[PDB]
Chain A
Amino acid sequence: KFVEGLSNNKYKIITGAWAASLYGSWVIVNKDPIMTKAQKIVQARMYAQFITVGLLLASVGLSMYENKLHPNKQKVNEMRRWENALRVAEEEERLEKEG
C-alpha cells in the first residue's frame, strides 16, 4: 500500500537518514567531552555510515519485497507514456480530418 509511495522516495530518504544518524549521534558522542572535536566527528561518522549501509541493504530487501506487486517494470509504464502519447495523436488526427 504505502510501499512504493515511499519507495520512489528511496534515495531521498536514506541520505536524510544518514544526516539524521550523523547529526543525531553527534550529541551522544559530544555529551561526554574529553576527546578533541575531530575524534568525535570521526567516531560519530563511523557509527552513522554503518547505519546507512545497513539501511541500504534493507533498501534492496524492500526493492524485492515490493515488485512482486507488478512484474516487469522499467517498461510497463513506458507502456503508459507511449499508449496515451499514441492516442493523443489520435485526438488531433480526428478533428483535423473533420475540422
Chain B
Amino acid sequence: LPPNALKPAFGPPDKVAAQKFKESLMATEKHAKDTSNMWVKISVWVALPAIALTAVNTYFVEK
C-alpha cells in the first residue's frame, strides 16, 4: 500500500488537441471519399481506354 498510488497521473485533460484530433479523424474521411471518387474516375476514363487501345495493338503483334 503506497500512499500516492491513487492520485491521477496526468492532471487536466486537454480539450482542443482532442477536438483537433477528432476533426482530422473525420476530415480525412470526407477527403478520402472525394479522392476515391476522382481516382476511380481517372482509373476508368484513362486507364481502361489505355488497355483498350494497347490490347488491339498487341493482338496484331501476337499474330
Question: A35–B34 Cα gap in the complex (Å)?
Answer: 12
Q: What is the interface of chain B mostly: helix, strand, loop, or mixed?
A: helix
Complex interface bits, A10-43 against B, C-beta within 8 A gives 1, otherwise 0 = 0000000000000000000000001100000000
Complex interface bits, B9-37 against A, C-beta within 8 A gives 1, otherwise 0 = 00000000000000010011001000100
Q: Across the interface, which residues of A come within 8 angstroms of B24, CB to CB?
A: 34
Complex interface bits, A33-55 against B, C-beta within 8 A gives 1, otherwise 0 = 01100000000000000100000
Question: A50–B27 Cα gap in the complex (Å)?
Answer: 29
Q: Across the interface, which residues of B come within 8 angstroms of A50, CB to CB?
A: 46
Question: A34–B34 Cα gap in the complex (Å)?
Answer: 12
A residues 34-88 near B (Cβ < 8 Å) are 34-35, 50
Q: Across the interface, which residues of B come within 8 angstroms of A34, CB to CB?
A: 24, 27-28, 31
Question: A34–B28 Cα gap in the complex (Å)?
Answer: 7
> Which residue from chain B places its CB closest to the CB of A39 in the assembled complex?
B35
Question: A50–B31 Cα gap in the complex (Å)?
Answer: 24
Least distance between B26 CB and chain A CB atoms (Å):
12
6 new A-B contacts, CB < 8 A, other than A34-B27, A35-B31, are A34-B24, A34-B28, A34-B31, A35-B28, A35-B35, A50-B46
The 4 A-B pairs of least Cβ separation, nearest first, read A34-B31, A34-B28, A34-B27, A35-B31
8 A-B pairs within 8 Å (CB atoms) are namely A34-B24, A34-B27, A34-B28, A34-B31, A35-B28, A35-B31, A35-B35, A50-B46
